[PDB]
Ligand binder design. Structure first.
Ligand code: FES
Ligand code: FES
Ligand code: FES
Ligand SMILES: [Mg+2]
Ligand SMILES: [Mg+2]
Ligand SMILES: [Mg+2]
Ligand SMILES: [Mg+2]
Ligand SMILES: [Mg+2]
Ligand SMILES: [Mg+2]
Ligand SMILES: [Mg+2]
Ligand SMILES: [Mg+2]
Ligand SMILES: [Mg+2]
Ligand code: NA
Lengths: 560, 555, 558
């Protein structure tokens, strides 16, 4: 039978623990509490971004649930950054490393205090995988709860027209204004509308994709991802999350009993079915690594080839998470995939029951057909994300799936985004070019920046469907099937992307899953002698440490 | 000066429409884009009493920043309990918390383009973690302490009444296991040691570093001493938010304040307070983060000229609330300055110098009981002694509560083997007890070991044996920080059972008295154990951490 | 120059104030804060209703504003009830009395602590006029800030239809279900959608009406009413409210400098233009009484005559307050009224500037034409509200209008007797149904009855019967529902002398409500009138009944 106190007997039990008991009294524990499991309630609450604002009330509601189930909760805090506020300046270099700092933050507190289990609360992009990575690493009972999505805003423009707007509409408005196609007054109108109050980005970006993936991994209560941050149903999910973690301790269940290979395959299938963020490839690889579970880029290909793209969601589709909530949330996609034999029903979850048993209990409706397509009428018969291999990316790369044709182009090679933006401004990027931005990898950037300026400018210059964008970094906001990221090995590791020179020919076959450089292997291989990595830009502090310890993007840019 | 050295990246120009749009959703309006943005970094949590006051104090810092025309944005970071972590595997995760906290503040401040910070900490390692981030960022930064816990009084079965704390609970446990105290009396002490919010009241790491923060000029003068439960801390909080905005108006940043001279002020004040040996490790690391040259020999030099004045636990009688009653940290600082043992011209977070601050607040002279006048010291020199010599070529640290101490080496790989030996009677009077592989890499995490110090004292061998480690000690002669550590093939790794060790306090020497040639002939036989932690924060820490001799810095 | 501490030198200055200073240190004041004005921040925050949830964060942002302007804020709390959750049970008798308890609560703290000025924060119906009454009564610098409106919720029905719903839709769902016209599943779908999270009722009920009235009185910052509770623009209005109260102290401005006759006329005009709640009549009469300003039911008639219904907003219209916010909020209505000469521009406000000066500074757009109509194309030519007098209501009555009814009286002592007669089939087409002993004293608490209006409406009798009370009515019948009949039955008004068979006439155009029995015989019955004994002989309602005035003067307690 499970010990409901697998760690906290180190601080509560026996003559020798008098000093620890004396300190725990001073945070409120009394005689009756020392026999209870201790639950760490880790919140990335802050006011530096709206994404995290709901986590204060939700952590409180988690503590109420832990108490309701006979546990003792202890709240603590960790950082997040704003993936939105950090865009367009030096802060973009500090987004992905925040993931590592959050996972380490949770590990250190849980290990130091000998807590038995956790509930982990996150809002903004990198804090979700940061928490899930800590949960995997610790292999204690753990429940993940999301902040919830922001509500959509509506801009009134100068011509009397109106549009629903989000972050991307603010960046695009700036671009329209710079090309003389939009007034500064109309950029102002969009700015005032995009973010009304608390909640993470409403589109299918990293936060909503990973909140959906956490339901799919069985690490969040089914139905918990979709209700908006402002919606008090989140409070109920919070109290039930605190109750659930105490029951996992009673069962002797830990995070690695839930994070099995099959649970990761269920996350891949759900992310493929939502046309989730390509960032979910990086994060799910990293979470598998932290859970000591074998997972490769090819597992993404294999599962993704069998799962249709169903969700018509921003940024590439029409709808936002509040619309997915309205038609029944993530359980609708999970039930559709289970009924089609595309989900492992027998995966244990944080309910203490299997994915199939959870879905039987809540009986989601069928896909509505607009927000989530019917399985027989999908956006694409296979996954919303495509994994590539070939001579340019022998350790793999990722691209959002298109309808389209094969692309061949003459390589145009840049060390960093700034160089490519300059070349675009000077007219040296034209139809048929393959634009290659290298030294943007985990080590090269450093931090593997999500670049939005080059995709924005290519679209603005009308070159959206005529140019191929390729990077060892990441892209946001480009044309489906024409922005390739995560090219491994990255330039700093002397991968083929580092050997490229202006004029080399590149071929991308998305349907055939191939990204090749057309140069004679022998001739191409011997330029290897000339490769030299630029010296690290950041020689002190968190980014200097990151560059020393970080792995390839091909295995999730893990540091441990 | 430009009052927005950073935040123009998120508030200014056409291109910042998206960042402005998100900043409106945390409550900023049109008039707030022109204001400096202050990160208010709280290590608040409920896992230890040390951090409980930080929630209301963060709120008061925000009120201060608003009152001075800034815009504060609160965020959280971790802290661990140095007390609750004692006696189990959690002790391996105490020191590394310092590095995670420093990184966490750097990440938020760099990602969000904030102009300055107010940094709030309670428990041992969170104070140096915040100070290291401030030094590393080189923006306007003010540090504010959670404040001390109130002392609790235990009534014992024998009608006795004593003020008790963590060490009193650990000692009670030892007394009870040796049949010299009832379980009833152990329970009475348990119930009294921590009544509620505030850090340890003795001159442990937290109070030492809070005092050192005033001495660095990084905290408002007088701010360290008021207890966590006292509402004067709220006024210091509001004045801390006001102060950071004024630093922006004057274009002052942390490295303007953290000069070599400020570090020598901090060492002076720590020596005078009988401060924790942990302050050696933390000030070396904070200087490294400020790009300021600071070495163990700097500690020895300042320490030679600065007497121990504070009669404070654990060595003395009083706690920080007693220090508060008689005028707090500025009383020690004025006494040192008057004697020419403090640099008066050091710029501080007030925008004025240490001398100008002390002139403004006119602290009283030492009271004679809680703080001694200079002519009347507890010891004529600093409590913290720096050693070198053939066993510690890169340095070691000992609290000298000044003769030659010796022993035949009894050598253990980790604390457990030393305790097993004490239990088997194989440790006797005159032994030099060496616990190696407890360094930053070896432990890993350079534990502050309490089990062996407690067990030796409990066995009556306290004054009869020498204690030596490449890790750290709490309670109890106890030599720590021995460098290079065992994992790096330092002399401590070559020691064998029987080697003669000599500690010479006067000469500042810790020697192995082996023939140098015979001793060096042992190097070929050394091989380090493989890392115990192969995943997570401790596998990373072992890969990056420096020698304790330069502060166990990671980057 | 005005003393910026008109009250707080009683607790900070002089030898005798040593104790008071020592206590203020313990809430955080240091030596420098004793020279600052002290601002009471009064929050009706609670969790008993969603209406109040935003007030915790907004009270915090008020404090930031006070600190930003050199004041020292001290937060304290008062009650509020839920006008929604109180509906349908004995709790309804405790709604209006909460207004008086809230007013007394703020008076007590402000007078005890010698605070210089206040920011008052309210969300649910009765708490807004409670706070405004306290502000008028104290005559210190005061700024009012609303919680903000709830967001609209979307129900998907078994039908496959989708509706935006709120409380009335939940109560009508229940009526439709018990008459076999809606499934239980669809009632549950509506229940789940009506209230997503924090905020007050989104329609033009008492809260939104009084929040709009507060902007029109000059007691709230212009544009502050309309932004939803969940919208962080409310935080900016909170910080500016804290800044505003300190600047009122610097200028020596107090609440009665702002609450002039002209400002109440502004409030009446804005309430009429919004098709606002008839409860606004009761509360604006009470606020004017507390402010020592002459205001009568006749003023509502005079101003109401000249102001058209502009806002196409629930419950009458289609839209909710978030829609009004989208098109530029209450300032759009106030500028429209100012330009048409239907607003007094020279009224001093909590900005320290005039109503005209404020609207010039923020330049609201013109009415959009859908949510807010231009005056050229109003919904109704005159105000939604009609004031009546006559032999049945000598001290007046109030009816929501949109023509001449004559009927035989069917008389009930209390709503329950009327509901029983409807189920019995005793209430029929042509009846003038009289529910008496529901006034301030009679009820007690002048309940807003929804059960009889819903049951009559459900029974298809809406257009066929006249509903009359000395209480209040909530919801329409799609017919005529006359409230506030004064004097009330307890005070031996005509309503108490009525008997089964008397005839009654209601002439909306004539502003008349008459009992058509012969004067001489009707008077003859006064000798045998005996009021029932108070049901509540203990506690707050026993004290309320002893002190409350006529609804004709706002049901004030003195
Ligand atoms: S920026 Fe935080 S979730 Fe998008
Ligand atoms: S345990 Fe936290 S300061 Fe002592
Ligand atoms: S019930 Fe509170 S505003 Fe309607
Ligand atoms: Mg909280
Ligand atoms: Mg992102
Ligand atoms: Mg197991
Ligand atoms: Mg707080
Ligand atoms: Mg310590
Ligand atoms: Mg400088
Ligand atoms: Mg509050
Ligand atoms: Mg009401
Ligand atoms: Mg006056
Ligand atoms: Na570049």
């Amino acid at each position: 039978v499970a010990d409901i106190k697998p760690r906290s007997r180190d601080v509560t039990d026996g003559l020798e623990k008098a000093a620890a008991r004396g300190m725990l009294r001073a945070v409120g524990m009394d005689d009756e509490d020392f026999a209870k499991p201790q639950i760490g309630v880790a919140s990335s609450w802050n006011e530096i971004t709206p994404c995290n604002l709901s986590l204060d009330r939700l952590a409180n509601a988690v503590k109420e649930g832990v108490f309701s189930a006979g546990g003792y909760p202890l709240e603590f805090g960790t950082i997040s950054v704003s993936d939105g506020i950090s865009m367009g300046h030096e802060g973009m270099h500090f987004s992905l490393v925040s993931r590592e700092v959050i996972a380490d933050s949770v590990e250190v507190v849980m290990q130091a205090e000998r807590l038995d289990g956790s509930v982990l609360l996150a809002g903004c992009d990198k804090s979700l995988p940061g928490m899930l990575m800590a949960a995997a690493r610790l292999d204690l009972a753990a429940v993940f709860l999301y902040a919830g999505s922001i509500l959509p805003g509506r801009a009134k423009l100068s011509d009397g027209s109106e549009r629903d707007v989000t972050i991307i509409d603010a960046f695009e408005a700036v671009g329209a204004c710079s090309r003389g196609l939009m007034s500064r007054a109309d950029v102002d109108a969009i700015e005032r509308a995009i973010c009304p109050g608390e909640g993470a980005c409403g589109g299918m970006y990293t936060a909503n994709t990973m909140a959906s993936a956490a339901e799919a991994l069985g690490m969040s209560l089914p139905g918990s991802a979709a209700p908006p941050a402002t919606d008090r149903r989140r409070d109920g999910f919070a109290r039930r999350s605190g109750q659930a973690v105490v029951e996992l301790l009673r069962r002797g269940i830990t995070a690695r009993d839930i994070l099995t290979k099959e649970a990761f395959e269920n996350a891949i299938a759900v992310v493929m079915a939502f046309g989730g963020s390509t960032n979910a490839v990086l994060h799910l690889l990293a979470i598998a690594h932290e859970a000591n579970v074998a997972l490769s880029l090819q597992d993404f290909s294999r599962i993704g080839s069998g799962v249709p793209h169903l969700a018509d969601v921003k940024p590439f589709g029409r709808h936002v998470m509040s619309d997915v909530d309205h038609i029944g949330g993530v359980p609708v996609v999970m039930k559709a995939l289970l009924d089609a034999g595309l989900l492992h029903g027998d995966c244990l979850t944080v309910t203490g029951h299997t994915m199939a048993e959870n879905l039987a209990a809540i009986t989601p409706p069928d896909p509505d057909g607009k927000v989530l397509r019917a399985l027989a009428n999908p956006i694409h018969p296979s996954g919303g994300i495509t994994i590539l291999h070939g001579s340019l990316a022998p350790e793999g790369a990722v691209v959002k799936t298109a309808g389209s044709d094969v692309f061949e182009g003459t390589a145009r090679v840049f060390d960093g985004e700034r160089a490519a933006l300059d070349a675009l401004e000077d007219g040296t990027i034209t139809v048929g070019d393959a634009v290659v931005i290298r030294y943007e990898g985990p080590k090269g950037g450093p931090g593997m920046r999500e670049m939005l300026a080059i995709t924005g400018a290519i679209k603005g210059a009308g070159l959206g469907k005529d140019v191929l964008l390729l990077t060892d970094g990441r892209f946001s906001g480009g044309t489906t099937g024409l922005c390739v990221g995560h090219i491994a090995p990255e330039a700093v590791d002397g991968g083929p992307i580092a050997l490229l020179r202006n004029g080399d020919r590149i071929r991308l076959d998305v349907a055939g899953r191939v990204l090749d450089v057309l140069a004679d292997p022998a001739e191409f291989a011997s330029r290897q002698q000339d490769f030299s990595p630029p010296p690290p830009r950041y020689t002190t502090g968190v980014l200097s440490k990151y560059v020393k310890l970080v792995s390839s993007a091909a295995v999730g840019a893990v540091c441990g």
